[PDB]
DNA sequence: GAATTCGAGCTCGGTACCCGGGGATC
DNA sequence: CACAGATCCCCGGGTACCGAGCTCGAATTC
């Protein structure tokens, strides 16, 4: 083998099919940044954030040996190294091997595809194999720490968490968790609020460290295009107060496990 | 005093005063800024160190040399001075007309007068005696002559004598609509009737015409234009001079000539100095009876050269802004002329004229004394009419017989008569060799779609602009005077810049000098181009043999010089070229016949030996071989129904038309004669080059080249629509059996040596040359007369040679005795691009790179330069061309898939250095210095969105100095700015009211020296993407043609790196965030790495 | 209705043709 | 008022589909 590699044959090959699925197009040109941890996917829709991990337990085989090395998705500026997952781009398929050969800057990729042939082996696209050479100097901006507080949401929740906030700079749309813990989401016309309660009705929401209240407001308004471009099937809202831009990050917990990162207005508190 | 007026100023008592305020030393500082402009009341004045002249004095002492002989009426020669004339080169002929009452107290004889009566064409040949002495001789007798169907004018007419066609058009002369020929005769023609053939369409049969014999070349113009405008005149497009050569054979326009006897013992008469029509020691009138060619004598009789140059100040509220000969306060400041001597080579005067005192520098006249060359002799003048009419009576007084200088027709020459003219109002007319009414003219393309250049003509002075030789001479993307001499003398010089020239121009006469040296070393450096080049001595060699004079070789095209041959041939042979240009006089991309077919190449990278069979010069060898010409041709089968279908006539489908085409041994083409008779003379010359002296093998070389271009412009000749005398069947069927022939010889070698056992059964030597592998002879490629044959299997050793008889050996077999394939070349590798680009490497030679855009002018040294890397890496690195071999074992598809080869790796690295080199912001600009042609004046584009006119457009707004058409327009490509934006931006609304997103290249260009002078920064995104595509271009044969699997493998070379933008960067960085790339240290970065996934998990 | 389909409608490059123009090649 | 020819690639600038996405908008409906 390779001296990195990462394969995915099914009951691993399965799962990502269910990870990429709704993503669509959008990640497609992006940034892999691989390592021994797994494949860090990261994007930005409209400006914002945004990353999809997918750790190294995640696939059939995960082996890496070397430093962290940052492939842009996009061969030869047409082609994308995370079509091969597109939801049905090469129906049957069966296998897809990573296979990253050479010297610590500069490393190649290939991505060999494969195909179940009908009673077969495989079918193995040769005319679909990609070749990619790391980036060699690379600089990615990646989500710290844990969160000041994050509230799991079901989809229902959440489609009406953000069908509340307006995109459009003119309104500014405000989060707020206050004291009993409803937390509520608002703007001059639109209000929405929910009930939390801990972990450890179909408007309540569960969540971690609900004490920490919290009231941020947001600008530089993308949050729901991207959220709806991503295709966000329900997910954990979480709030990073402690920075002097505080930031929002929603993760799905859906068949996806994307994230779409946000920042905020510096806000007072403690 | 004379008989015909001299109209240069031999006294001047008032002009305009016009001179730089700053001059005037005591001035205070407001009075300095400005001009001087006005009327001033007394002679020209020059001022050679402390001493004074008057301008226009020709007594003993001058301050610059004289070679006349009258001033002004006045016989500056000494007693007695009589030199006998027997022998005298001839440098320019003009025709001027004479009267006989302009000419009564002239005291001529009778002969002469008789041949000018009421009026006559004297033929003037300018030249020198072997002494030295300037030299004219009017020849009297040349009339010119055109012929008409007699039957056609006869039933047009009703002429029932020749005195009747006589009467008529003296008659149509008089009734002109202006009164352009009052008192115009019928003893004013003489009609005579003759039997000629038209030149065309051989069935065509001998009839009568009149041959009219008009005395003036304007009456002919006007009875060629409209005397019975549906009659066919035959050839009123022929000079007085072209008679005058023509009718006397031997006869040249350039060279040496005797005065014979004459018959009758008429001897050629001296003219009394009063009666010179020009400036010249000596002057004879005679007939052509008294001339002989005078053969034995080669060689040039010290005819001077003047190179000059001219340094222009601009007045005004911007004196950065360029000089214009318009205006007033736009002068002339400084003229730098060098006076050679043409047969020895040597700079004998070096003058400066300088408005307001000059005080050359001390390091440039020991320059000079340390060269041997000729100490300045700085003039210096108060204003500006005095500095030129010091000039202009410099250039009459001496009267060079050549003159050059570097871009003189466009900007020197023009600048001077236009101040000559608008503001001053001298008469150049006798300011050349003639005493008056002499062409002194200059033509600029300006709005004329068909001129290709700008002419002047000064009578009896050939004007040979170097910038025009160095054009047709060298390939540069700039033809810059300092380009020019670091490309061909090896001579780094130092420019001054036209703005500096108003500073250095207020300091004092020291600053003054430093402007002086430079406008020196402009003209010493045009003299070593123009005696290195040596222009004239092969455009006399084309002048001799095309006869016509050498301002016609140097200016009027390609087209006359064939016609003259042609006409001289074809009046031997009895026909006559008819006119139909005449009737054309008042006249996406058009093509008016086939051409050469390329043959489609099997492009890639050949590094087997690659044969390269051409034909010498195919197309006259096949106007010889088959006998073409107007004469023979025939569309009609009617024609040669009397003939056998071979053994007298060729038959071919030219156009789908059948033309005829017959034998040299019933009628002998008359271009066959013309190509034959000169590929023998020219085979003469170059057989005696070898054993000759090295200085008449300089002659001798000129000579046989000169024969070389006229043998090639032969067929071109043919297919010059609405041309003098087109012949599109002729020029159809030329190339028409060339590419029969082409198609002929590939299947020849196809069927003849497809296996070895033939070549050796052809030729033995091939045992010695069999390469390991299989055998093939296939053919690869040709353009219009050669064919590539990759000969695998053989060995590129001994195979030129054997190529030479395989040559031979095809000639022999397919093509007639003056057709000659032959074998020169042979590649040991080859690169075929497309059909006419290629890269090959010669056995044991050079690199040949053709069409591929290192050849190109357009292009800038950056790209240039990288791309001469990579292709030397390709031909020269055995590493990289096995890799590059090796390419070729796969389709083009696989190699997006797979690793290169492994050779391939310096390949990639030239690509890396230039994409670091780039974006260096220590970038020499020159470098990235694009340039385009101004082909057209810029109100002809169809598409006025181009790069080069962008730049034009912006100059003319700045006052820069504008192109010329012709002219290289040098730009780059800015960065595309806020700046930029805006500016294209308004200059859209201010242009369109006169009568996010990328711009385009046309609206992103400037022209470099602005680019400069402004802190603008270049496109690196330009520079580089082209820089790939010229890459991709040349090196998309490797990866079977496909420019988009080349572009993507060459892309991958090119490290990629990503950041988030600037803004987010610091914005993040406030938010504790940190470098974790190379930008500060490696080991810092990795230990941010850690602790960032740390931090992560 | 709430998701939910592909349905219908936008736009947004992509690739390709077409043309003039530069400037080679024979 | 002056005038070799034609062929050919390539680039810049222009247009015109047109599939791919790509969300909205509203019949058919778990
Ligand atoms: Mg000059
Ligand atoms: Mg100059």
């Given amino acids: 083998g390779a001296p990195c590699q990462v394969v995915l044959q099914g009951a691993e090959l399965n799962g990502i099919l269910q990870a990429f699925a709704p993503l669509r197009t959008s990640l497609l040109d992006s940034l892999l940044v691989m390592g021994d941890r797994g494949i860090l996917i990261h994007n930005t829709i409209f400006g914002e954030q945004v990353f999809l991990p997918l750790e190294h337990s995640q696939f059939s085989r995960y082996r890496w040996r070397g430093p962290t090395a940052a492939f842009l998705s996009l061969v030869d500026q047409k082609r994308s190294l995370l079509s091969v997952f597109r939801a049905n781009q090469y129906p049957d398929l069966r296998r897809v091997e990573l296979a990253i050969t050479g010297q610590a800057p500069f490393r190649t990729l290939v991505q060999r595809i494969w195909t179940t042939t009908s009673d077969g082996e495989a079918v193995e696209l040769a005319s679909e194999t990609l070749m990619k050479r790391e980036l060699t100097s690379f600089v990615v901006l990646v989500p710290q720490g844990t969160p000041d507080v994050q509230l799991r949401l079901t989809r229902p929740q959440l489609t009406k968490v953000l069908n509340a906030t307006g995109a459009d700079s003119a309104t500014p749309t405000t989060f707020e968790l206050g004291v009993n813990g409803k937390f509520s989401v608002f703007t001059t016309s639109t209000c929405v609020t929910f009930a939390a309660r801990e972990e450890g009705n179909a408007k309540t929401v569960y969540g971690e460290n609900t004490h920490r209240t919290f009231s941020v407001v947001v600008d530089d308004c993308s949050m729901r295009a991207v959220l709806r471009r991503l295709q966000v099937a329900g997910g954990t809202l979480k709030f990073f107060l402690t920075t002097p831009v505080p930031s929002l990050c929603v993760t799905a917990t859906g068949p996806n496990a994307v994230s779409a990162v946000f920042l905020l207005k510096p806000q007072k508190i403690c | 005093g004379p008989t015909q007026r001299h109209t240069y100023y031999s006294e001047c008592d008032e002009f305009r005063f016009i001179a730089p305020r700053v001059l005037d030393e005591d001035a205070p500082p407001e009075k300095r800024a400005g001009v001087h402009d006005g009327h001033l009341k007394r002679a020209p004045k020059v001022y050679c160190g402390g001493d004074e002249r008057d301008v226009l004095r020709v007594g003993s002492g001058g301050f610059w040399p004289r070679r006349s002989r009258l001033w002004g009426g006045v016989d500056h020669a000494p007693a007695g001075f009589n030199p006998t004339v027997t022998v005298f080169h001839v440098y320019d002929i003009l025709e001027n007309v004479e009267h006989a009452y302009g000419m009564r107290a002239a005291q001529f004889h009778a002969r002469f007068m008789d041949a000018i009566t009421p009026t006559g064409t004297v033929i003037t040949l300018l030249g020198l005696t072997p002494e030295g002495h300037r030299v004219a001789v009017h020849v009297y007798g040349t009339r010119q002559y055109f012929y008409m169907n007699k039957e056609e004018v006869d039933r047009h007419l009703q002429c029932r004598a020749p005195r009747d066609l006589c009467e008529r058009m003296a008659a149509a002369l008089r009734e002109s609509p202006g009164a352009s020929f009052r008192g115009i005769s019928a003893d004013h023609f003489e009609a005579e009737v003759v039997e000629r053939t038209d030149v065309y369409y051989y069935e065509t049969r001998p009839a009568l015409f009149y041959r009219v014999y008009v005395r003036s070349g304007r009456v002919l113009s006007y009875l060629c234009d409209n005397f019975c405008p549906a009659i066919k005149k035959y050839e009123g497009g022929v000079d007085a001079t072209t008679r005058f050569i023509l009718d006397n054979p031997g006869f040249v326009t350039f060279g040496w000539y005797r005065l014979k006897p004459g018959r009758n013992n008429t001897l050629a008469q001296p003219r009394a100095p009063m009666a010179f029509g020009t400036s010249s020691d000596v002057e004879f009138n005679c007939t052509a009876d008294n001339l002989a060619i005078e053969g034995g004598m080669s060689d040039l009789p010290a005819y001077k050269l003047m190179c000059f140059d001219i340094e222009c100040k601009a007045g005004g509220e911007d004196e950065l802004a360029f000089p214009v000969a318009g205006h007033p306060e736009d002068l002339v400041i400084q003229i730098s002329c060098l006076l050679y001597d043409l047969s020895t080579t040597a700079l004998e005067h070096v003058l400066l004229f300088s408005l307001g005192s000059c005080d050359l520098p001390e390091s440039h006249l020991n320059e000079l004394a340390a060269r041997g060359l000729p100490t300045p002799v700085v003039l210096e003048f108060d204003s500006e009419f005095e500095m030129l009419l010091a000039f202009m009576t410099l250039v009459k007084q001496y009267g060079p017989e050549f003159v050059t200088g570097y871009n003189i027709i466009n900007f020197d020459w023009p600048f001077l008569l236009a101040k000559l003219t608008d503001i001053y109002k001298v008469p150049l007319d006798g300011y050349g060799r003639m005493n008056g009414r002499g062409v002194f003219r200059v033509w600029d393309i300006g709005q004329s779609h068909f001129q290709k250049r700008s002419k002047i003509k000064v009578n009896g002075m050939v004007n040979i602009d170097m910038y025009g030789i160095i054009t047709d001479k060298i390939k540069l993307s700039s033809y810059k005077l300092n380009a020019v001499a670091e490309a061909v003398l090896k001579d780094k010089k130092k420019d001054l810049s036209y703005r500096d020239i108003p500073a250095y121009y207020a300091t004092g006469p020291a600053q003054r000098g430093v402007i002086g040296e430079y406008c020196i070393q402009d003209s010493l450096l045009v003299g070593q181009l123009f005696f290195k080049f040596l222009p004239h001595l092969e455009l006399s060699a084309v002048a001799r043999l095309a006869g016509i004079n050498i301002t016609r070789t140097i200016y009027d095209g390609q087209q006359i010089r064939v016609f003259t041959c042609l006409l001289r041939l074809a009046d031997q042979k009895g026909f006559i070229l008819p006119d139909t240009q005449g009737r054309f006089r008042g006249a996406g991309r058009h093509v008016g016949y086939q051409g050469a077919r390329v043959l489609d190449p099997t492009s890639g990278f050949h590094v087997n030996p690659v044969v390269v069979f051409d034909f010498a010069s195919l197309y006259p060898s096949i106007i010889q071989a088959h006998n073409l010409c107007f004469s023979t041709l025939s569309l009609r089968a009617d024609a040669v129904a009397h003939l056998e279908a ?349 009568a996010p997103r990328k711009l385009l290249v046309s609206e992103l260009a400037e022209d470099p020296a602005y680019a400069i002078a402004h802190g603008v920064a270049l496109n690196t995104d330009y520079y580089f993407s082209h820089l790939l595509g010229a890459a991709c271009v040349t090196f998309k044969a490797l990866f079977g043609n496909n420019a988009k699997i080349t572009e993507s493998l060459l892309k991958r070379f090119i490290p990629e790196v990503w950041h988030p933008p600037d803004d987010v960067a610091a914005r993040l960085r406030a938010a504790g965030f940190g470098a974790v790339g190379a930008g500060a240290t490696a080991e810092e970065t990795r230990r941010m790495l850690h602790r960032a996934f740390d931090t992560l998990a």
């Avoid at chain 2, 040949?848 to 001469?868: W, Y």
Wanted: charged fraction near 25%; glycine fraction near 6%; proline fraction near 4%.
């Fill in chain 2, 646 to 994: 071979g053994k007298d006539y060729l038959e071919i489908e030219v156009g789908g038309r059948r033309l005829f085409f017959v034998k040299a041994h019933v009628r002998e083409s008359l271009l066959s004669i013309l190509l034959r008779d000169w590929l023998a003379m020219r085979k003469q010359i170059r057989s005696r080059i070898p054993q000759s002296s090295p200085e008449e093998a300089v002659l001798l070389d000129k000579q046989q080249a000169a024969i070389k271009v006229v043998c090639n412009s032969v067929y071109g000749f043919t297919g010059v629509q609405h041309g003098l005398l087109p012949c599109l069947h002729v020029a159809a069927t030329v190339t028409t059996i060339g590419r029969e022939m082409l198609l002929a010889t590939r299947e020849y070698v196809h069927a003849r040596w497809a296996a070895f056992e033939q070549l050796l059964a052809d030729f033995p030597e091939a045992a010695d040359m069999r390469a390991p592998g299989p055998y093939s002879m296939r053919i690869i490629y040709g353009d219009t007369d050669s064919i590539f044959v990759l000969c695998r299997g053989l060995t590129a050793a001994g195979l030129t040679a054997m190529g030479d008889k395989m040559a031979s050996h095809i000639s022999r077999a397919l093509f007639l005795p003056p057709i000659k394939l032959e074998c020169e070349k042979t590649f040991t590798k080859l690169l075929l691009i497309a059909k006419k680009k290629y890269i090959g490497v010669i056995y044991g030679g050079k690199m040949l790179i053709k069409g591929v855009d290192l050849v190109r002018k357009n292009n800038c040294a950056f790209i240039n330069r990288t791309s001469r890397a990579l292709v030397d890496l390709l031909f020269y690195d055995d590493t990289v061309s096995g890799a590059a071999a090796a390419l070729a074992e796969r389709p083009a598809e696989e190699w997006l898939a797979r690793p290169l080869p492994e050779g391939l790796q310096a390949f990639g690295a030239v690509l890396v250095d230039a994409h670091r080199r780039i974006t260096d912001p220590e970038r020499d600009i020159q470098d990235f210095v694009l340039t385009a042609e101004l082909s057209r004046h810029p109100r002809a584009y169809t598409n006025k969105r181009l790069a080069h006119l962008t730049v034009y457009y912006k100059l003319m707004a700045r006052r820069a100095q504008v192109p010329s058409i012709k002219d290289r327009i040098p730009y780059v490509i800015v960065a595309q700015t806020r700046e930029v934006e805006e500016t294209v931006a308004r200059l859209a609304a201010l242009r369109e009211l006169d």
